[PDB]
Amino acid sequence: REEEDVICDGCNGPVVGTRYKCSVCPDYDLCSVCEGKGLHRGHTKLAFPSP
Ligand SMILES: [Zn+2]
Ligand SMILES: [Zn+2]
């Protein structure tokens, strides 16, 4: 089967739990580790579940 997964654009790891999606850049997401490290603070991000 084909599945749609979310990959972190900061570290290339899986994004599980909460994803931090850029509201400006196309198709851009951070994992909680990279979000906590302060990546991509120059744009507003949307925080919502990444099941
Ligand atoms: Zn990451
Ligand atoms: Zn952005």
Residue numbers in the entry: -3 to 47
Copied sentences from the primary study:
In an effort to elucidate the manner by which the ZZ-domain of p62 recognizes N-terminal arginylated BiP/GRP78 (hereafter referred to as R-BiP), we generated the chimeric protein N-terminal R-BiP (R*-E19b-E20b-E21b-D22b; where “*” and subscript “b” represent attachment to the modified N-terminus and BiP residues, respectively) fused to the ZZ-domain using a special expression system. Using this fusion protein, we determined the complex structure of the ZZ-domain with R-BiP substrate at 1.45 Å resolution. As expected, the binding site of the ZZ-domain comprises a negatively charged patch for recognition of the positively charged N-terminal NH3+ group of R-BiP. The side chains of Asp129 and Asp149 in the ZZ-domain form hydrogen bonds with the α-amino group of R-BiP. Moreover, the key carboxylate of Asp129 which is involved in recognizing the α-amino group also forms an ionic interaction with the guanidinium group of the N-terminal arginine residue. Another negatively charged residue, Asp147, also participates in the N-degron binding, and in a manner that is not sequence-specific. The side chain carboxylate of Asp147 interacts with the main chain nitrogen atom of the first peptide bond between the first arginine R* and Glu19b of the N-degron. The main chain nitrogen atom of Ile127 also forms a hydrogen bond with the carbonyl oxygen of the first peptide bond of the N-degron. However, the side chain of Asn132 is re-oriented to form a specific interaction with the side chain of the N-degron. It is rotated 72.3° and moved by approximately 3.0 Å to facilitate recognition of the guanidinium group of the N-terminal arginine.
Intriguingly, the autophagy adapter p62/SQSTM1/Sequestosome-1 was recently reported to recognize N-degrons, the N-end rule substrates of the well-characterized UPS, and where ultimately these substrates are delivered to ALS8,9. p62 is a key selective autophagy adapter that plays a role in the degradation of various cellular constituents such as misfolded proteins and their aggregates, malfunctioning organelles, and invading pathogens. Intriguingly, it was recently reported that the central ZZ-domain in p62 plays a critical role in the recognition of N-terminal arginylated BiP/GRP78 by the Arg-tRNA transferase ATE1. Here, we present the high resolution structures of the ZZ-domain of p62 in complex with 8 different N-degrons including type-1 and type-2, and subsequently identify key determinants involved in the unusual recognition.
